Amino acid sequence: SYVRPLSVALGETASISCGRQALGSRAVQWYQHRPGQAPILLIYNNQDRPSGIPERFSGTPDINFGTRATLTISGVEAGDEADYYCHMWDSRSGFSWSFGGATRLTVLGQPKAAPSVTLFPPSSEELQANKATLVCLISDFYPGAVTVAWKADSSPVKAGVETTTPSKQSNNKYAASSYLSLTPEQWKSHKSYSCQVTHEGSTVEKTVAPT
Amino acid sequence: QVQLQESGPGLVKPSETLSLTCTVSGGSISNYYWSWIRQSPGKGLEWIGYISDSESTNYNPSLKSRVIISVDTSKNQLSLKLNSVTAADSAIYYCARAQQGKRIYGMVSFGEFFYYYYMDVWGKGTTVTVSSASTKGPSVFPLAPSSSTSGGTAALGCLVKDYFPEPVTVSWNSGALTSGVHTFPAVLQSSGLYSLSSVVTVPSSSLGTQTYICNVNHKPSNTKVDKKVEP
Amino acid sequence: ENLWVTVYYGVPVWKDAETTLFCASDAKAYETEKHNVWATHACVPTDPNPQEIHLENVTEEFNMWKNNMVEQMHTDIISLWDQSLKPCVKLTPLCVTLQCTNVTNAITDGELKNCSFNMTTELRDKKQKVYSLFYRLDVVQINSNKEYRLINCNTSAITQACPKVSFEPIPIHYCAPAGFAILKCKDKKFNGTGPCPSVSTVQCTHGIKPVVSTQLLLNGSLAEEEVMIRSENITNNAKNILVQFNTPVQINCTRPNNNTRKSIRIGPGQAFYATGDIIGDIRQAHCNVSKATWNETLGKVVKQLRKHFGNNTIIRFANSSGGDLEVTTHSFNCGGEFFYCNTSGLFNSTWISNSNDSITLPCRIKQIINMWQRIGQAMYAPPIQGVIRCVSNITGLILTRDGGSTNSTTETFRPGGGDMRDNWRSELYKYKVVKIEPLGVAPTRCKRRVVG
Ligand SMILES: *[C@@H]1O[C@H](CO)[C@@H](O[C@@H]2O[C@H](CO)[C@@H](O[C@@H]3O[C@H](CO[C@H]4O[C@H](CO[C@H]5O[C@H](CO)[C@@H](O)[C@H](O)[C@@H]5O[C@H]5O[C@H](CO)[C@@H](O)[C@H](O)[C@@H]5O)[C@@H](O)[C@H](O)[C@@H]4O)[C@@H](O)[C@H](O[C@H]4O[C@H](CO)[C@@H](O)[C@H](O)[C@@H]4O[C@H]4O[C@H](CO)[C@@H](O)[C@H](O)[C@@H]4O[C@H]4O[C@H](CO)[C@@H](O)[C@H](O)[C@@H]4O)[C@@H]3O)[C@H](O)[C@H]2NC(C)=O)[C@H](O)[C@H]1NC(C)=O
Ligand SMILES: *[C@@H]1O[C@H](CO)[C@@H](O[C@@H]2O[C@H](CO)[C@@H](O[C@@H]3O[C@H](CO[C@H]4O[C@H](CO)[C@@H](O)[C@H](O)[C@@H]4O)[C@@H](O)[C@H](O[C@H]4O[C@H](CO)[C@@H](O)[C@H](O)[C@@H]4O[C@H]4O[C@H](CO)[C@@H](O)[C@H](O)[C@@H]4O[C@H]4O[C@H](CO)[C@@H](O)[C@H](O)[C@@H]4O)[C@@H]3O)[C@H](O)[C@H]2NC(C)=O)[C@H](O)[C@H]1NC(C)=O
Ligand SMILES: *[C@@H]1O[C@H](CO)[C@@H](O[C@@H]2O[C@H](CO)[C@@H](O[C@@H]3O[C@H](CO[C@H]4O[C@H](CO)[C@@H](O)[C@H](O[C@H]5O[C@H](CO)[C@@H](O)[C@H](O)[C@@H]5O)[C@@H]4O)[C@@H](O)[C@H](O[C@H]4O[C@H](CO)[C@@H](O)[C@H](O)[C@@H]4O)[C@@H]3O)[C@H](O)[C@H]2NC(C)=O)[C@H](O)[C@H]1NC(C)=O
Ligand SMILES: *[C@@H]1O[C@H](CO)[C@@H](O[C@@H]2O[C@H](CO)[C@@H](O[C@@H]3O[C@H](CO[C@H]4O[C@H](CO)[C@@H](O)[C@H](O)[C@@H]4O)[C@@H](O)[C@H](O[C@H]4O[C@H](CO)[C@@H](O)[C@H](O)[C@@H]4O)[C@@H]3O)[C@H](O)[C@H]2NC(C)=O)[C@H](O)[C@H]1NC(C)=O
Ligand SMILES: *[C@@H]1O[C@H](CO)[C@@H](O[C@@H]2O[C@H](CO)[C@@H](O[C@@H]3O[C@H](CO)[C@@H](O)[C@H](O[C@H]4O[C@H](CO)[C@@H](O)[C@H](O)[C@@H]4O)[C@@H]3O)[C@H](O)[C@H]2NC(C)=O)[C@H](O)[C@H]1NC(C)=O
Ligand SMILES: *[C@@H]1O[C@H](CO)[C@@H](O[C@@H]2O[C@H](CO)[C@@H](O)[C@H](O)[C@H]2NC(C)=O)[C@H](O)[C@H]1NC(C)=O
Ligand SMILES: *[C@@H]1O[C@H](CO)[C@@H](O[C@@H]2O[C@H](CO)[C@@H](O)[C@H](O)[C@H]2NC(C)=O)[C@H](O)[C@H]1NC(C)=O
Ligand SMILES: *[C@@H]1O[C@H](CO)[C@@H](O[C@@H]2O[C@H](CO)[C@@H](O)[C@H](O)[C@H]2NC(C)=O)[C@H](O)[C@H]1NC(C)=O
Ligand SMILES: *[C@@H]1O[C@H](CO)[C@@H](O[C@@H]2O[C@H](CO)[C@@H](O)[C@H](O)[C@H]2NC(C)=O)[C@H](O)[C@H]1NC(C)=O
Ligand SMILES: *[C@@H]1O[C@H](CO)[C@@H](O[C@@H]2O[C@H](CO)[C@@H](O)[C@H](O)[C@H]2NC(C)=O)[C@H](O)[C@H]1NC(C)=O
Ligand SMILES: *[C@@H]1O[C@H](CO)[C@@H](O[C@@H]2O[C@H](CO)[C@@H](O)[C@H](O)[C@H]2NC(C)=O)[C@H](O)[C@H]1NC(C)=O
Ligand SMILES: *[C@@H]1O[C@H](CO)[C@@H](O)[C@H](O)[C@H]1NC(C)=O
Ligand SMILES: *[C@@H]1O[C@H](CO)[C@@H](O)[C@H](O)[C@H]1NC(C)=O
Ligand SMILES: *[C@@H]1O[C@H](CO)[C@@H](O)[C@H](O)[C@H]1NC(C)=O
């Protein structure tokens, strides 16, 4: 149905159990999948890793029955964090079409990174189009949990606010963006507009004003 | 040494036939197997079917009634066709090269061997949305530099107003500038159209003028838009 | 010139006699596991050293086919089987209707069946629904889910072999009482019947293992020098053919399935041993036989075969074609499970003009058995835990001709097992029972002291 969570300290090895354990002799495939990217198989046969894969990942051979297919990751790092699927093929069960239930690997103890916020006022060409959007961009922040509150002056806006859920980038840090839709007349009326981003206990505020 | 390229519409009306094409450049289609996998948001990835080198199909029982897989001999491409699609059929679609393995736990003559498959090479993946809503070309507005941190450093960007559907590809100077680029994921507004932003971090000494232009492409809209950005 | 009769007591004189023999076997404490049916609680221990006394000049006629030691041993095995079955649990309530499904596999192959059924508990009023694993041969269908019954329930009652007793054959020495003796033919080239030039006398036979077998003979004794062909009459097709090897072939039989035993209580004291679910792969039982050695042994057989069929003639081998399933397959017991093997791969040959590659034989398994053509009380062999693997010497064979055909054109040999006694004859061919008549009267020139 849905994903099972796993948490590991940074730099410490981890074992990933496989659901629907086999009834007879089995050949298991371990796939590494990142959301939005192409899945990479780490182990096609239970021992066996394709070329290019680091030696840190390993799986159990079923030399003697009774062993449980697990995925061992040594030197756990940020890049290891991901979703891992366990494709099972045993002799007793028939054709196994579905992959295993996903396993969300999270790496604990990662160093937190302050968010880099950049607020952009609406373009003049957008104002000619009779529309206005304030664009608040947040990059390179971990852990990926932020709250965005918009202010005009003192006042909060609370309307026309649309924010993306944070998404991981190649930096292994998260990235989120917030859009405040406004009418050009409302943009000209107020003195300045402020984007407030709260990350953990800290809070960063950026301000922009009409020309 | 094998490359897979997924090409398709990216948007299909509900209750219509979806088609996709997966071109292979590394090797002949008739030596290895091929398979289709789809990844829908909020769910695990799903194996839907595979095709053999000798052109023998086999489908997942859940979708068996609606899926047809084909492979072309003249072109190293394999096609996927899905009938009576709905909003759930919309997902990221991957085609992958599957190799066959034989696992023997007893003696072969009586049986006691089962075949297993595994996909070593994957394509980048094409996204497909299913909705009655029409296509909407993007509106590109430049984001002027604030003039931001005591230098080097300053930031500019491009805004892609509401469009449909995903994805939008963004390059800068036709791929000439790669450093400092960061294209954020789009937001689905209550309007029903996505909106994204793309920023570049450059030194204020670079200004000016370095003549920074951003290029935006929307495959469903059939429109390619280039916009100049300046203070 | 005057001759008088004189009495001599203890003269070496004997006559052919049939008497009641008794058992003898060396004592193994076996304090851990006990009570194999043949050794019983007791069988008389063997003498520390047996005495085999050669008889110079003595030539005695033997007939292995008119031997009574065979019939005695036959009735002894049968009676021993019944004596060991009496105290064990009889499965009269196990004839409930069974709802059975196949054991899980991808359906590329599957004999064995998963059977659920009701069963009386210990309290008379309460009932339990339990499940057991049954091989296909033990059960037959009547009508739905599907519905099944045990094959025996319409022919006879059934009783479960006690788990402690072992079916392993141990050597049993047949001994004659005082006043009788056993004569042993030591002729290497000895035909089945006829005058034996080299004869010795013994009080007890050698250690004979009562191996219950069909087709090929197992764990027997090997003839020295040439292999031996023994029949009651060679030219008669109806009479079987006994073959004894000089070199033993090796045969390995394994049941790879890693079975489990489930003890379900079916009454006060009573306990049925159901077959639990298999652990691991589903593999069927088999036996390999080295193709090279079996080709050599088959070659030596046909060399001795042609000595009775012409120096040149077509001698071919075919599979069994007569009778029910229990006579068509090489039936035997290994570790407590009863194996039944397709032997067609061993007897598919034709002989004319004078890698490892081990042959493999498929073997099915039955848990309900009626050996020695027994109609009536059947036996349920309890399941054996773990994987089974036994190595056996195959020392002999039992063959049969096809009979009516155009003579001397081609000769065809198929394996048969018409009777179980032929297995006893294969090891009793050399022994014979006689009674000592120690009273001899002869004339000498000796007279007793006159009364007058
Ligand atoms: C009576 O007589 C009959 C007839 O002789 C006899 O029948 C035999 O019974 C045996 C068991 O009783 C049975 O044995 C098993 O045999 C399996 C097959 O062995 C052969 O093939 C394999 C594979 O060959 C492939 O792949 C190799 C590896 O890359 C490759 O080099 C070859 O080129 C070949 O590829 C080619 O052919 C493929 C088709 O198979 C094709 O797909 C390819 O495209 C290519 O064309 C060889 O490795 C052997 O050398 C033999 O040649 C064997 O696979 C199996 O054991 C495994 O399973 C056991 C239990 O399930 C485990 O306990 C054991 O450890 C093995 O598991 C290991 O390997 C598997 C798969 O490789 C892996 O999934 C596991 O994780 C585990 O890996 C670990 O060990 C391996 C190596 O051992 C290491 O590499 C890893 O790093 C891990 O450490 C059993 O060995 C036999 O099949 C059967 N024979 C026949 C012909 O019937 C019967 O036994 C006799 N019985 C009596 C009466 O005594
Ligand atoms: C032709 O001749 C050949 C050669 O003689 C025959 O081959 C023989 O084949 C036999 C199989 O049918 C085989 O017998 C068995 O061998 C098994 C393997 O032995 C291994 O271990 C020994 C060490 O002990 C090694 O030396 C050897 O090399 C092997 O590695 C044994 O495991 C078997 O033991 C059991 O079964 C018999 C009868 O069923 C019992 O009498 C015996 O006590 C064993 O049973 C107990 O233990 C098992 C263990 O799981 C339990 O499952 C079972 O319930 C029993 O446990 C209960 O009882 C004990 C004792 O009271 C108690 O402690 C416990 O708590 C429980 O209550 C068995 O011995 C022969 O070894 C093999 N011959 C040779 C020389 O190896 C061939 O069959 C012949 N052909 C024909 C047609 O007959
Ligand atoms: C089984 O059946 C066979 C055949 O029927 C029996 O063999 C016969 O045994 C009888 C009695 O033992 C033999 O009769 C006697 O023969 C001896 C031998 O003659 C001597 O001279 C030979 C010529 O030089 C010489 O080669 C012989 O060598 C043999 O014998 C000695 C042992 O004595 C041995 O050590 C050597 O190696 C040789 O093998 C031998 O020296 C002969 O001497 C006898 O005469 C004497 O004995 C009688 C009493 O028996 C006495 O009355 C005389 O006055 C004289 O003193 C006697 O003739 C017969 O030859 C054997 N062979 C036949 C009949 O063909 C055998 O005994 C049976 N055994 C059993 C267990 O039933
Ligand atoms: C012959 O036929 C019999 C039926 O009479 C089979 O016996 C059944 O075997 C199945 C196995 O497929 C058993 O089903 C399993 O039951 C387990 C019992 O649950 C216990 O644990 C829960 C807590 O989780 C307790 O609340 C409960 O009281 C029990 O103590 C389940 O745990 C199993 O669930 C697992 O498998 C499912 C499969 O979809 C997964 O989705 C789950 O996540 C989990 O991994 C499972 O449901 C059944 O109970 C057996 N019945 C009986 C009467 O024995 C034999 O197996 C069959 N044999 C052959 C050879 O065919
Ligand atoms: C057929 O299947 C049965 C299962 O029903 C199987 O019996 C099992 O064998 C295993 C052996 O692998 C037993 O497991 C052992 O149990 C003992 C009991 O305490 C433990 O001490 C053992 O621990 C050792 O092995 C570990 C392996 O990781 C080591 O890490 C450890 O340090 C010890 O050295 C071990 O766990 C199991 O108890 C039995 N179960 C039963 C019910 O008998 C049988 O072996 C199978 N046979 C075949 C031929 O496949
Ligand atoms: C168990 O397996 C047997 C095969 O050994 C199945 O028997 C078959 O049943 C189908 C009915 O769907 C018939 O068409 C076939 O002819 C049967 N084959 C044989 C060899 O008899 C049986 O249906 C299976 N039962 C279950 C419950 O799975
Ligand atoms: C007992 O039941 C068996 C079935 O298990 C009967 O065997 C059948 O006998 C008939 C003869 O009328 C044959 O045509 C069938 O082929 C037999 N079936 C099998 C599976 O062997 C047997 O006749 C029954 N005996 C009695 C006395 O009722
Ligand atoms: C075993 O060999 C003996 C020879 O000692 C056979 O006995 C002879 O058999 C032939 C015919 O086969 C008869 O003509 C002779 O009269 C028999 N001789 C004696 C002394 O009885 C015996 O038949 C052979 N047995 C088999 C089964 O071939
Ligand atoms: C039956 O099994 C025995 C042993 O389990 C086999 O004997 C082995 O033969 C191989 C040669 O292939 C030798 O390397 C081993 O050393 C032997 N083992 C022993 C204990 O001597 C025998 O070959 C098997 N026979 C068949 C027909 O399968
Ligand atoms: C024993 O094996 C032989 C050959 O392996 C089996 O003969 C086969 O019989 C089936 C019909 O039952 C035919 O379709 C096959 O063509 C036969 N094989 C050959 C090679 O001719 C025989 O049936 C087996 N015995 C049992 C009881 O299954
Ligand atoms: C199985 O047969 C073999 C013959 O290959 C037997 O091994 C021989 O045993 C006898 C004693 O009975 C020795 O004189 C031989 O030297 C042995 N042969 C070899 C090659 O060493 C083996 O004992 C038999 N196993 C049984 C009867 O259980
Ligand atoms: C078990 O007994 C019940 C009676 O309570 C019956 O309804 C059911 O069909 C029985 N099940 C089988 C497999 O015979
Ligand atoms: C030997 O067998 C043949 C059958 O071919 C038979 O006619 C003959 O009477 C038999 N001879 C004896 C003495 O039994
Ligand atoms: C004997 O072999 C024939 C093939 O000639 C086959 O049809 C038959 O089933 C076999 N019988 C046995 C009992 O193996």
Q: What is the DSSP string of B99-110?
A: EEEEEESS-STT
Pairing between β-strand C158-160 and β-strand C378-380 as defined by DSSP bridges:
parallel
Instruction: Indicate yes or no: CB of A91 within 8 angstroms of CB of C282.
Output: yes
Mutual angle of helices C68-85 and C421-428, in 10-degree steps: 130
* Domain range summary for chain B, segments of one domain joined by +: 1-132, 133-231
Beta strands in C69-126 (DSSP E): 98-102, 113-120
Q: How far apart are CA A13 and CA A71, in angstroms?
A: 10
Nearest CA to ligand 4 atom 43: A20
Sheet holding C180-185, edge to edge: C14-16, C431-436, C180-185, C199-202, C52-55
Q: How far apart are CA C393 and CA C222, in angstroms?
A: 10
Say how many Å lie between the CA of residue C342 and the centre of ligand 10: 9
By C-alpha distance, which of C397, C400, C424 is closest to C322? C400
Q: Which two tokens stand for residue A50?
A: 């394709």
Q: How far apart are CA B144 and CA B158, in angstroms?
A: 8
Is B1-132's fold the same as B133-231's? yes
Class of residue C28 by CB neighbours under 10 A (exposed 0-12, middle 13-18, buried 19+):
exposed
For domain B133-231, give the fold: Immunoglobulin-like (2.60.40)
The verdict on the CB of residue C319 being under 6 Å from ligand 14 is: yes
Residues 6+ apart with CB under 8 A from B100: B33, B115, B116, B117
Q: Which two tokens stand for residue C129?
A: 């629904």
Chains in contact with A, where contact means 3 or more Cβ–Cβ distances below 8 Å, are B, C
By C-alpha distance, which of B119, C29, C210 is closest to A44? B119
Q: How far apart are CA B12 and CA B167, in angstroms?
A: 14
By C-alpha distance, which of A194, A172, A156 is closest to A112? A172
Say how many Å lie between the CA of residue C92 and the centre of ligand 7: 20
**Residue B141 touches partner A, C-beta closer than 8 Å:** yes
Buried b (16+ CB within 10 A) or exposed e, C369-387: bbbeeeeebbbbbbbbeee
Q: How far apart are CA B85 and CA B93, in angstroms?
A: 14
* Cis status, amide bond into C146, omega within 30 of 0: yes
* CA-to-CA separations, B64 to A100, B12, B21, B115, C383, in angstroms, rounded: 20, 20, 19, 20, 43
Report whether C449 contacts C12 (CB < 8 A): no
Residues 6+ apart with CB under 8 A from C27: C45
Say how many Å lie between the CA of residue B113 and the centre of ligand 4: 26
* Cis status, amide bond into C179, omega within 30 of 0: no
Report whether C361 contacts C287 (CB < 8 A): yes
For domain B1-132, give the fold: Immunoglobulin-like (2.60.40)
Say how many Å lie between the CA of residue C150 and the centre of ligand 6: 18
Distance between B115 CA and the closest CA of chain C, angstroms: 11
Q: How far apart are CA C40 and CA C77, in angstroms?
A: 12
Q: How far apart are CA B43 and CA A22, in angstroms?
A: 23
Q: How far apart are CA B33 and CA B24, in angstroms?
A: 12
* Domain range summary for chain A, segments of one domain joined by +: 1-109, 110-211
Beta strands in C64-141 (DSSP E): 98-102, 113-120, 127-134, 139-141
Residue type, B209: T
Residue type, A180: L
Q: Which two tokens stand for residue C305?
A: 């075969």
Alpha-carbon C31 to chain mean position = 27
The CB density around residue C142, as the number of other CB atoms within 10 Å, is 11
Chains in contact with C, where contact means 3 or more Cβ–Cβ distances below 8 Å, are A, B
Task: Give the N- to C-terminal CA distance of chain B in Å, as an integer.
Answer: 46
Residue type, B42: G
Our CA angle for C192, C194, C199, nearest 5°, is 90
Q: Tokens 């495939």: give the residue.
A: A29
Cβ neighbours of C360 in B, within 8 Å: 107, 109
Q: How far apart are CA B89 and CA B38, in angstroms?
A: 9
In the three-class reduction of DSSP (H, G, I as helix; E, B as strand; rest coil), residue C76 is classed as helix
Which of A91, A94, A95 is nearest residue C281 as measured by Cβ atoms? A91
Report whether C157 contacts C90 (CB < 8 A): yes
- Check the CA dihedral B166-B172-B173-B179 and report its sign: negative
DSSP H helices in C222-365: 291-305, 325-328
The verdict on the CB of residue C386 being under 6 Å from ligand 5 is: yes
The verdict on the CB of residue C219 being under 6 Å from ligand 11 is: yes
Alpha carbon dihedral B162, B163, B166, B171, in 10-degree steps, equals -80
Which of C106, C108, C281 is nearest residue B106 as measured by Cβ atoms? C281
Q: How far apart are CA A47 and CA B111, in angstroms?
A: 24
Which of C106, C283, C362 is nearest residue B106 as measured by Cβ atoms? C283
Our CA angle for C361, C364, C369, nearest 5°, is 130
Distance between B112 CA and the closest CA of chain C, angstroms: 7
Q: Which two tokens stand for residue C370?
A: 């009626």
Residues 6+ apart with CB under 8 A from A211: none
Chains in contact with B, where contact means 3 or more Cβ–Cβ distances below 8 Å, are A, C
Our CA angle for C229, C231, C235, nearest 5°, is 105
Total number of residues shown for chain B = 231
Q: What is the CATH number of domain A110-211?
A: 2.60.40.10
Residues 6+ apart with CB under 8 A from C382: C160, C161, C163, C261, C273, C336
Choose, out of A67, A91, A96, the residue to mutate when testing the contact with C (most C CBs < 10 Å): A91
Q: How far apart are CA B184 and CA B196, in angstroms?
A: 6
For domain A1-109, which architecture applies?
Answer: Sandwich (2.60)
Name residues contacting ligand 13 (CB within 6 A). C 233, 235-236
Helix or strand holding residue B163 (H, E): strand B153-163
